[PDB]
Structure formats: C-alpha cells, structure tokens
Amino acid sequence: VKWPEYVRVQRQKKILSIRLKVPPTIAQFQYTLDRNTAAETFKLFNKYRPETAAEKKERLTKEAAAVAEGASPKPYAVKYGLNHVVALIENKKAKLVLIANDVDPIELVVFLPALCKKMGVPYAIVKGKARLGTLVNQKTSAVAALTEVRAEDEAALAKLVSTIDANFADKYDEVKKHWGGGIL
Template identity: 65%
Template sequence: MTCRNPILFQWSNDPRESEATLECSQCLSSVELWKLAPVKKSKVAPAPYPASKKGAAKAPVNPLIEKTPKNFGVGQDIQPIKDLSRYVKWPEYVRLQRQRKILNQRLKVPPALNQFTQVLDKNTATQLFKLANKYRPETRIEKKERLTAAAAAQVEKGDKAETKKPFVVKYGINHITALVEAKKASLVVIADDVDPIEIVVWLPALCRKMGIPYVIVKGKARLGTVVHKKTATALAFTEVRAEDKSELASLVSAIKSNYTEKNETARKAWGGGLMGFKSNMKMVKRANAVKNSL
C-alpha cells in the first residue's frame, strides 16, 4: 500500500516495529524502508576564541627583558661548565703512581713490602718531627759563616779554637746502615714511599736483628725537610743533648707500644688481593646465577 503524501511521512518510534517505517499523518499508511540511513545530528561550531577561566590571570611580562635561548650545537654557544678531569691527559709520573697503587691493591704483596703500608699514627709522628727539627744539620750558609768566624778568631788569637761536635740527625742510607751495624743509632726513621723500594726494604729486618728501634712514617719529602733536602729515605738519631734524653726515651717507648707491638702480626701478613668494583659486581652476578640455577 502506497501513500501519495510523502511529505507528511514521519518517523515511527514504536519499538515493536522490526524495520524502519514511515507513517502518513493523514491516511496512517506505512511504507517500509530498506536500509534507511540514520540521520546525523548537526554539531554546533565551537566558539572562535575560548572563554578565559576566571582566576587564571597571566603574570605580567617585562617587555625590556628578552628571551635568549641557547643553542649548544657545534660551533654555537659555549657549553656549560663540567668536570673534565676524566678526560685530562695526566703527566707520566701521576699515571705511574696511580697504576702502582692499583697494582699493589690487586696483586698479592709479600710481607716484606706490605709492612710499609703500616705507618706511625699522626700524634706520635708530630712529636717525632718536633724532636727531629731540634737536631737539623747546618746548611751551607751556616757552615760557611761558622768556618769564617773560626778562621777570624784563629787569626786574632793565633791558635785554633777547639769546637764541640754538634748533635744532629744522620741521613744517607749507607751512613745509617753503618750506624745500625755498629749499634750507634738510638732510633731509625724510614720513609714509606721510597722508590725503588729495594733501597730500604731490608732495613727493618736489619734493625730488628741488631735490636735497634725503628719506625716507618709517611713521606720521604717530610724527612727531606729535616735535613734540607728534597727527599730522604731514612733518618737516624745517635746522640741528643742532656735536656732531650727523657723526651727521646718517652718517644721510643711510645713507638714500641703504638707501632712495633701493634703491627707485629700485620708485619707478617700478606697484602693486596683486593678486587675492583667491576670484578666484585661480576662475582655477585655469577653467584646469583649459580643460586638461581639450583
């Protein structure tokens, strides 16, 4: 059945209808539609400028200050400051001493060499150098002045004046060795950073053999300042003035208690054998893999 008034058709909203139909408002006739496309609802166009939210006012911008963004490309702005010590080509002596330190940590070090890692504590070392500075040998200028004054006195009086032997610390490895073998040394002070170490590696054993107290301290340069040299491998006390004998005796007893007896077991122990961070992480990873496989 067809209707001649298609303009009066309207949608049927009856949910019982299985297909979309049109009903005429006059004859109430219905027309079945095949695959009728749904009508799309028209969207309202958005406003050209969104409304600003209340309370979100922009901060005033100073027109005198201009933004100057930096470009860190090649040949552009200067790069920011950073630590470049990793990329520094260090001098050869710095590289050698760092490599030597790492090798002494990684490899097994025999007791004769490992004993030089045990040094005197700071407080006792301060007392030691305080006493040693009282017995510094004369410099070349002081020696020249002394000989000039003695020669002038000899010219005036006509006879040579008798001079007393000064009390000074002894230095020089051969001289100290002779003093130790003759048992004339009261105390021997050895540097821990002598290079090559073969110069003094046997000296502690010789001191123990002859029964002479010895001590290992930090810095051959510090020993050198006592005798007006750049460096000194060892120093030796032989004789001191009467007013300093008690101080030397107390210093020797402090060294025996704080150094000799304390490091007796460490003196016989092997050193080194310490792995680095990367090796430790590899061992941990390997141990975890074995643990997970079980």
C-alpha cells in the first residue's frame, strides 16, 4: 500500500502536531471564539465588507460622469492588513481584533494576541483564515480589525466586545499553563 508523498507528509505533520508538546506561546490558539459568537461577529462584519474593485470602479465612473456634465464622511470599513493592523494596535486606535488560527507561518501571528492583551485592546481568535478572506474580497488576510463604526452598529460592537471578553479572554486566560500537545 502506498499513498501520494505529499498526503503522507501532511498527515505525518498533523499527527506530529497533535502529539508534540508546544510552549504556551504556541497553542494559544485552539481555544477560539465559539460558533455562536463567531457567527455573530461574522454578521456584524458582513455589513462592512470593503468595496471591491468592481464596486469602486463603477462608483468612480458614475461620479466622473456626473462631474463631466457640470461631503459624505469616511466610509467605515474593516481593517485587515497585517502591517496596518499591527499599526492600529500599539496605538490604541483599534477596538476589535480578529486573529486567524491557521496561519502557515506561525511566527507571523504568535505575538499578535500577546501584544493585543498587553495594550489592553480587545482581541478574538477565530477559526479559518479563509473566512476572514471571504469577507475582505481576498483569499485570506490572517487578521481583521475594526475602526470607527456607524452609530447604529456601535451598540452591537460594544455587546460583541463584552461577549468576547466574557467568553474567550477571561475564560482562556489560563492558557498560559497546560502545555499543548500532551495528548497520549
């Protein structure tokens, strides 16, 4: 019996990560926002999908056409860029931060939750970088953050932040102990 080499390699990697002891800085993920609150966050974030290329192009063409014949505030949108997210973090401008748990280079995201908690900025870990990508008109971003929001959604954002603090931040603060990967 034989299977493709890459399939065997990835299966071995999975069964090794399941069995290899990792420092608490690793395995800080795998304790993630529950399905309920994750769906609520997606619903809240689904209303602030960044304008896609087609939408921006059509809007600009329409504006130009009106101008050719001869005021609104900044459109609130989710911030996802890792460099931009880490810049909103450490500056206190960020209100809600989402972290993908399935980033290929783990080192790129290990320090993000620690920095977020050090700066006292709410943060949440959500399964699937694709899910963040699906709502940002990209394949994946590995991170998502929120900025100034419409007054209508301010109460929803505050409630979501409180729920996240009650569910994940406070409950899983013990994640520092219990070195992951100890399953027999």
